[PDB]
Structures are given as C-alpha cells and as structure tokens.
C-alpha cells in the first residue's frame, strides 16, 4: 500500500520529531520562571517557551525531505508564516482534555487559559485556540499522521512571499499523497475520506487562527517587546 518512498518519508519525519520534541520537558527548567499571582507575569516564561519551540520547529523543517533544497528566502518565508501554527499543532502532545491545559510534567509547568492571558493575550483569541486543541485531540491521530500534518503545514505554496510556489507545491503534494495513503492503509472508505477531510479542516482552522492573531498583531502599536527574545522578535516581525 505504502510505497517504499512513502515509508521513507514517514521514517524521516518520525525521526525528525523524535530528535526535536523531548517529552520530559527538562529544558523548561532553563527558562525564565513562570510567575502566577506583572501584570504580564507569565510573558517572560511563555516568551522563552515560544522561542525554544521556534528553534525546534526550524530543526524539524530542516529534516523535511526537499525543504533544504528550496532557496533560503523561501525557507525563511515558510518558517516565519508557519511557525506559530506548527507550535500550536506540536503543543497538542502536552495538551490535556480533563483540565483544558498544556501539562508539561509539573504544576509549575502546566499552562491554562489564565496563564496564557498573563502573557498578554486576549481571552477572545485564546478560546478558539483551546477549542482547536480539543477538536485535534478528539481525532486521536497516529504519530505518523501528526508529523506529516506538521510537515504539510510548513511546506504550503500559499504563504505570502513564496517565490517558488511550484516547487513548494511539489513537496507538499508528495507529503499529502503519503498522508492520504497512510490513512487508506488504516481505514477503508468512507472513514478514510472523512478523517482526511477533518485534518484538512484543522489546517484551515490553524491558518484562520494565525491570520486572526496576526491581524490583531499587525494592528498593534516597548515594555513587553523588551521581554521577548531576539529570535521571537525576528520571526514575529
């Protein structure tokens, strides 16, 4: 069912994820500490978490077959546009349904709606993010699907600034066909079609979430910017 090339793609993506996601979360101890009582007391800790996560996303992207073959400029636009979406996706691994929080192994490293708001984010923007996480979690995806979706998310031809959209499209299509084939090996029709249609809808949701926060963001006018990291400043503009 899966050709050797499709299997080779998945093997590479699984290994990329395993190298870039540490489920012990030990590195969190080196962040500025979380502070819950200011007023943005969680912003240093959460800014470090985002900065760290951007680095992991870069790591992952560099292992995506053909990504490195793109021009540097196209690699840069793809990552600047996709980074927050991939972080939202990858974060589903820590997300817990019972508490509606991201549980990273300890009470201190367990993040809820109030903690995110203490990082300077609006409740109106956070609610769809939680909703997203719940819906994703309910799909109960295999790790093979999870890493392929992350990859598909990164390599999208329809991101602004992409010069070589055909080449970017050729990579995503190989990833997409691999994903479709994977699902079909796990499920006959029509369940296969329904599950794929759901993943596609989740990518559109992520995109709408990105566009809504960046709309807000681009429509904002130092005290908080000072607390961000150099890499976050660069990536988020």
């Amino acid at each position: 069912k899966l050709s050797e090339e499709q299997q080779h793609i998945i093997a590479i993506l699984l290994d990329a994820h395993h190298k870039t996601y540490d489920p012990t979360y030990a590195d969190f101890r080196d962040f500025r500490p979380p502070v819950r009582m200011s007023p943005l007391s969680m912003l240093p800790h959460l800014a470090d978490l985002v900065s760290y996560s951007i680095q992991k996303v870069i790591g992952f992207a560099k292992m995506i077959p053909g990504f490195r073959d793109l021009t540097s400029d196209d690699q840069i636009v793809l990552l600047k546009s996709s980074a927050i979406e991939v972080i939202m996706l990858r974060s589903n691994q820590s997300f817990t349904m019972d508490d509606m929080s991201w549980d990273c192994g300890s009470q201190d490293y367990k993040y809820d709606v109030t903690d995110v708001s203490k990082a300077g984010h609006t409740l109106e923007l956070i609610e769809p993010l939680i909703k997203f996480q719940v819906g994703l979690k309910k799909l109960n995806l295999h790790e093979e699907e999870h890493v392929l979706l992350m990859a598909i998310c990164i390599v999208s031809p329809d991101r602004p600034g992409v010069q070589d959209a055909k080449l970017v499209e050729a990579i995503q299509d190989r990833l997409s066909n691999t994903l479709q084939t994977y699902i079909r090996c796990r499920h006959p029709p029509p369940g296969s079609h329904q599950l794929y249609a759901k993943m596609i809808q989740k990518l559109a949701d992520l995109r709408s979430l990105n566009e809504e926060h960046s709309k807000q963001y681009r429509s904002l006018s130092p005290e908080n910017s000072m607390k961000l990291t150099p890499l976050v400043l660069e990536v988020f503009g």
């Binding site: 870069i58 840069i76 150099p230 890499l231 660069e234 990536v235």
Partner: peptide, 11 residues
C-alpha cells in the same frame, strides 16, 4: 534582514 533565522537554517 532575518539574520538569526538565516544562520539557524544554514547550520
């Protein structure tokens, strides 16, 4: 412009 990102991509 995006110097840190460029470096991170080249290494």
């Amino acid at each position: 412009e995006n110097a840190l990102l460029r470096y991170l991509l080249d290494k």
